[PDB]
């Protein structure tokens, strides 16, 4: 017990400039239990898709995923490997 | 009509689960954007996302098909 | 004795480059860390990119014979 | 006019490379069909994957910048010969 867990995430963001730079800054910040990540433009739809994996604590999870879900045009699901 | 949808799906690693998931992505490869498999052997499981953009017809029997694979579990986000 | 390694498949969409890619990578799934698939539609063509970790001559075994099947393109960069 | 590529990208762990490779990147945002990033942590190191449809004054220009970034390592294929 109290090790790191595997976690996945999926963003979509709304591709206009300030929701992709906040985004960004935030999993640079963030960047250290990243252990995958994928971006897929959707440009048909002005959105873009990123896919990640974590590998990391609660206390971490927790706190990227209360800070995405503050970013506006940002949509965030998160989900345990178990 | 077509949308775009985001498939995650968590397989526990055994040999009978993986080909079944495989046969069945085949199947459905028309409607797949991208497709992404990530191995988490110290779990022995794998992950795989997934983009597709299809109907719901399409999306349902999918999803529906993979969620009845032993030891798969599968989520579906439409894009919106 | 093992290292990681790059490898980018390109296959044009013939039913039996494809089989015979996904058959070869099957063999050396214990090896792949990652595999990522983007289909080019437009130009009936698919993009394939993995990351292995391995030693030698497996990651010469596995490009010299994706490179022999015909419409396959692969290119190995050793991760140093 | 435009073509697809598909570049490979191996990154050390600097705060000055990531910084460079992300500035550039962001820079060529607009024709980046898919960007996979790969960290290899037992090497210190990172691998970017990424597929474009472009000019060729884009993809020189992007291929050419990467290549001068100390740390960086950068294949540039067309995906079609």
């Given at each position: 017990?109290?090790?790191?867990?595997?976690?996945?995430?999926?963003?979509?963001?709304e591709?206009?400039?300030?929701?992709?730079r906040?985004?960004?800054?935030?999993?640079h910040?963030?960047?250290?239990?990243?252990?995958?990540?994928?971006?897929?433009?959707?440009?048909?739809?002005?959105?873009?898709?990123?896919?990640?994996?974590?590998?990391?604590?609660?206390?971490?999870?927790?706190?990227?995923?209360?800070?995405?879900?503050?970013?506006?045009?940002?949509?965030?699901?998160?989900?345990?490997?178990?």
């Amino acid at each position: 017990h109290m090790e790191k867990r595997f976690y996945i995430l999926t963003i979509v963001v709304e591709d206009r400039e300030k929701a992709y730079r906040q985004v960004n800054e935030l999993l640079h910040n963030f960047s250290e239990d990243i252990l995958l990540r994928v971006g897929y433009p959707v440009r048909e739809e002005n959105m873009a898709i990123i896919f990640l994996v974590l590998k990391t604590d609660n206390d971490t999870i927790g706190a990227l995923s209360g800070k995405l879900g503050q970013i506006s045009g940002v949509r965030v699901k998160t989900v345990p490997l178990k």
